[PDB]
Write an enzyme that holds these catalytic residues in place. Structure first.
Site, PDB file in Angstrom:
ATOM      1  N   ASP A 131      33.783  38.779  37.961  1.00  0.00           N
ATOM      2  CA  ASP A 131      34.023  37.545  37.214  1.00  0.00           C
ATOM      3  C   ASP A 131      34.140  36.345  38.142  1.00  0.00           C
ATOM      4  O   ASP A 131      34.438  35.221  37.737  1.00  0.00           O
ATOM      5  CB  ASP A 131      35.312  37.670  36.380  1.00  0.00           C
ATOM      6  CG  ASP A 131      36.568  37.818  37.213  1.00  0.00           C
ATOM      7  OD1 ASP A 131      37.680  37.969  36.653  1.00  0.00           O
ATOM      8  OD2 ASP A 131      36.516  37.782  38.460  1.00  0.00           O
ATOM      9  N   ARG A 167      35.062  30.878  38.698  1.00  0.00           N
ATOM     10  CA  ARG A 167      35.454  31.902  37.757  1.00  0.00           C
ATOM     11  C   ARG A 167      34.497  31.828  36.573  1.00  0.00           C
ATOM     12  O   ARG A 167      34.250  30.737  36.033  1.00  0.00           O
ATOM     13  CB  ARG A 167      36.887  31.606  37.315  1.00  0.00           C
ATOM     14  CG  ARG A 167      37.418  32.381  36.122  1.00  0.00           C
ATOM     15  CD  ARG A 167      37.701  33.804  36.551  1.00  0.00           C
ATOM     16  NE  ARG A 167      38.390  34.644  35.597  1.00  0.00           N
ATOM     17  CZ  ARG A 167      37.950  35.243  34.512  1.00  0.00           C
ATOM     18  NH1 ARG A 167      36.692  35.136  34.095  1.00  0.00           N
ATOM     19  NH2 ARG A 167      38.825  35.975  33.818  1.00  0.00           N
ATOM     20  N   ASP A 227      36.205  38.393  30.508  1.00  0.00           N
ATOM     21  CA  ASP A 227      37.069  39.225  31.316  1.00  0.00           C
ATOM     22  C   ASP A 227      36.337  40.511  31.713  1.00  0.00           C
ATOM     23  O   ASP A 227      36.035  41.303  30.820  1.00  0.00           O
ATOM     24  CB  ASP A 227      38.340  39.678  30.595  1.00  0.00           C
ATOM     25  CG  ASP A 227      39.372  38.576  30.445  1.00  0.00           C
ATOM     26  OD1 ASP A 227      39.382  37.651  31.283  1.00  0.00           O
ATOM     27  OD2 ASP A 227      40.176  38.628  29.489  1.00  0.00           O
ATOM     28  N   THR A 228      36.098  40.687  32.995  1.00  0.00           N
ATOM     29  CA  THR A 228      35.533  41.936  33.484  1.00  0.00           C
ATOM     30  C   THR A 228      36.663  42.799  34.027  1.00  0.00           C
ATOM     31  O   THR A 228      37.729  42.324  34.392  1.00  0.00           O
ATOM     32  CB  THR A 228      34.513  41.780  34.615  1.00  0.00           C
ATOM     33  OG1 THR A 228      35.217  41.279  35.760  1.00  0.00           O
ATOM     34  CG2 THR A 228      33.454  40.750  34.269  1.00  0.00           C
ATOM     35  N   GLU A 247      38.507  44.566  36.914  1.00  0.00           N
ATOM     36  CA  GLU A 247      38.495  44.025  38.272  1.00  0.00           C
ATOM     37  C   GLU A 247      38.658  45.104  39.341  1.00  0.00           C
ATOM     38  O   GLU A 247      39.233  46.155  39.089  1.00  0.00           O
ATOM     39  CB  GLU A 247      39.584  42.967  38.471  1.00  0.00           C
ATOM     40  CG  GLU A 247      39.430  41.796  37.507  1.00  0.00           C
ATOM     41  CD  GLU A 247      40.659  40.904  37.533  1.00  0.00           C
ATOM     42  OE1 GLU A 247      41.312  40.780  36.481  1.00  0.00           O
ATOM     43  OE2 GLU A 247      40.953  40.344  38.607  1.00  0.00           O
ATOM     44  N   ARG A 295      39.787  27.116  41.133  1.00  0.00           N
ATOM     45  CA  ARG A 295      38.442  27.656  40.893  1.00  0.00           C
ATOM     46  C   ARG A 295      37.668  26.863  39.848  1.00  0.00           C
ATOM     47  O   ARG A 295      38.213  26.427  38.823  1.00  0.00           O
ATOM     48  CB  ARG A 295      38.557  29.112  40.431  1.00  0.00           C
ATOM     49  CG  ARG A 295      39.368  30.004  41.359  1.00  0.00           C
ATOM     50  CD  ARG A 295      39.395  31.428  40.846  1.00  0.00           C
ATOM     51  NE  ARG A 295      40.225  31.588  39.651  1.00  0.00           N
ATOM     52  CZ  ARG A 295      40.414  32.735  39.014  1.00  0.00           C
ATOM     53  NH1 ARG A 295      39.859  33.879  39.403  1.00  0.00           N
ATOM     54  NH2 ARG A 295      41.185  32.736  37.945  1.00  0.00           N
TER      55      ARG A 295
END
Length: 135
Positions: A15, A29, A34-35, A37, A81
């Site tokens: 992500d 980002r 949402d991946t 992690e 980010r």
């Protein structure tokens, strides 16, 4: 919304990718997804984390052109980010992850929600196909 060019510096996670944007190195980002992690959170390397991470890396590394697209709202988060839609040769990385069952659509903070429906449609398809996260 407009696309802008950028140059890959390095993929960091499913992500998160480091890009050269308007002459500066910046961490981006990926908006709205949402991946799993390989970092946190949490529990270290989650299930499908290395997969999601290799997918984003291959996709941006093998591209001729990377472009970033900011949404209508804030363009950076509290960690410094960049918040954006990232495109590899015209294909949105955020959507591809979701279409492959390698990411879920995040909790959405308006007004950074332009591609929300599109992504949700891809997420619905990936669940129905029972891909990866959905298997």
């Amino acid at each position: 919304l407009h696309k802008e060019p950028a140059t890959l510096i390095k993929a960091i996670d499913g992500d998160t990718v480091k890009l050269m944007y308007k002459g500066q190195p910046m961490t981006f980002r990926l908006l709205l997804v949402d991946t799993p992690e390989t970092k946190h959170p949490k529990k270290g390397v989650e299930k499908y984390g290395p997969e999601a991470s290799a997918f984003t890396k291959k996709m941006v590394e093998n591209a001729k052109k990377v472009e970033v697209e900011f949404d209508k709202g804030q363009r950076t988060d509290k960690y410094g980010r960049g918040l954006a839609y990232i495109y590899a040769d015209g294909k949105m990385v955020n959507e591809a992850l979701v279409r492959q069952g390698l990411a879920k659509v995040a909790y959405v903070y308006k007004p950074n929600n332009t591609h929300e429906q599109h992504l949700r449609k891809s997420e619905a398809q990936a669940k129905k196909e029972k891909l990866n996260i959905w298997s």
